[PDB]
Design a protein around this ligand. Structure first.
Ligand code: GLU
Ligand code: GLU
Lengths: 307, 307
């Protein structure tokens, strides 16, 4: 209704979350540990293309696990729900290395499922063409705003990702991949996808595309099928916030996805997309200021699923 | 928009689910095993008070686990979210006897959590007054339509409920109950609540009250607080369908609760309530015809959360 007055409220919510200085910046690679704890930005993009930013909204950071819903959406878009879910389940595990009763990863939002989803995208071409394909897809989702790549993050991520290699070999042993998959090459592609860089501004438009039925709000183009969008939102609602996913569903009731860079990709269906970013993470791996901001936003604006 | 034409579609969906003859009638007590497999009814009550029934909609059956959301709602209504959730968690387990990391039952929809919720209601009075209190509450939810009691079910349920006694003593040992709780008397009250009888017709109005923000649509009275209703819908969405809850959330995306009598209490927020009932259950414990009907209903009418 009144965007300028909604904007004032976002700025007050921003300002209250800012005083919240707890948490620890991820440090398992130097490219994460570098980041200032005081960095804090929130960008909004409505379903009608209205924009508002406050704080550090033009500083690039890596999507990390925030890319998981986006590549899941790409796979469902290209391949359909049924094909994708031959390989990956549709529900939460407890707690956030094992497979479900059908020897599938529990869902696309845990590393095992994201690694499997990565193996399904653009099969038969080399990694450079797979990567370019996804990069172009994210450009459409972002209405051609900032989408980059951190080579330093990619190289450290691959050198230090012992757990992800253990998962890969485990998935190989349980036959979780499509026929003819080079698992080690899939891990590389996965590491690369984690290392894609956005700003709060550009990521908010990606979230707005999900909020707007798969149409990008600042270009008007259909980027994702209705089915892709719907599946992605369902899984972001139940599985997007690591071991906090249940509590977030209860108290906030919006589809969101967090990552270790401190991003929270938030969708308010039929209203807007947002990206909140602040490096310091709580014990569950979620941005301290962004979790605070999300609780406040739903209280103020009555955006809960079952409001 | 056009109720009479919506009604025709419900009848076609009813008719298609009817041909679905799989499943097994529960038989762990004779009061369940008695029931014909061919019994099948669907009742709708809209948020504006419009009614439609098809099939066996006036044959009483026991709420069984369908009562779980209703007593959880009563407790939050009387005591608030914060008090109730000192005792019970807010999220799914995997798979559907243990407690969460805080030694609480995972949520109100598993037996352990429902037993704890039962211990919180109307504390300090005797069981007859507790029971009368809840019966009167269900009368308000149902707009004074059919609410009864099966004494035969209550007596068999208590004689044969070895698992529930094991849970009770386990909860007693982990200190899960409020101070001064008679655990064995709480189990009785729990058995009694399972044995409350409704028809599809009367249960649909209970569901419509949840669909309508806690106001009963055929009387207009406020029965439940906004908070009670919202909490209940969140937990029905994630935890209401036993081990099928994840898949139901994905494919159907509505708050529902199933029970072993073959009932499915379904809420379509801001639109309507329904009760589907058919005794024969699938391997997960859900009504075969009602699961089929629910999938079909969401396909036809676009009622999914993230449609
Ligand atoms: N690259 C990290 C992603 C961590 C995250 O964003 O949670 C991993 O694969 O473990
Ligand atoms: N009285 C049954 C309820 C079963 C159900 O409806 O799932 C029990 O407590 O196990």
């Amino acid at each position: 209704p009144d965007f300028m007055s909604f904007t004032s409220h976002i700025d007050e919510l921003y300002e209250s979350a800012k005083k919240q200085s707890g948490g620890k910046v991820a440090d398992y690679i130097p490219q994460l540990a570098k980041f200032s704890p005081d960095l804090w930005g929130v960008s909004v993009c409505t379903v009608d293309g209205q924009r508002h930013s406050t704080g550090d909204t033009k500083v690039p950071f890596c999507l990390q696990s925030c890319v998981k819903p986006l590549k899941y959406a790409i796979a469902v878009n290209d391949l359909g729900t049924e094909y994708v879910h031959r390989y990956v389940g549709k529900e939460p595990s407890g707690l956030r290395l094992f497979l479900n009763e059908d020897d599938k990863p529990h869902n696309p939002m845990v590393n095992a499922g994201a690694i499997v989803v990565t193996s399904l995208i653009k099969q038969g071409v080399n990694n450079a063409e797979k990567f370019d394909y996804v990069m172009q897809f994210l450009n459409k989702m972002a209405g051609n705003e900032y989408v980059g790549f951190s080579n330093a993050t990619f190289q450290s991520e691959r050198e230090s990702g012992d757990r992800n290699f253990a998962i890969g070999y485990y998935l190989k042993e349980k036959k979780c991949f499509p026929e003819g998959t080079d698992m080690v090459g899939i891990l590389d592609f996965y590491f690369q996808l984690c290392s894609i860089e956005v700003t709060c501004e550009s990521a908010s438009v990606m979230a707005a595309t999900l909020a707007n039925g798969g149409f990008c709000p600042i270009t008007g183009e259909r980027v994702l099928s209705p089915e892709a969008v719907r599946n992605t939102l369902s899984l972001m609602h139940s599985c997007g916030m690591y071991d906090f996913s249940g509590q977030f569903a209860f108290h906030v009731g919006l589809p969101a996805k967090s990552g270790v860079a401190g991003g929270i990709l938030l969708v308010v269906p039929n209203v807007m997309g947002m990206m909140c970013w602040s490096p310091p993470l709580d014990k569950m791996g979620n941005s301290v200021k962004g979790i605070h901001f999300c609780h406040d936003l739903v209280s103020l604006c009555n955006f809960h699923n079952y409001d």
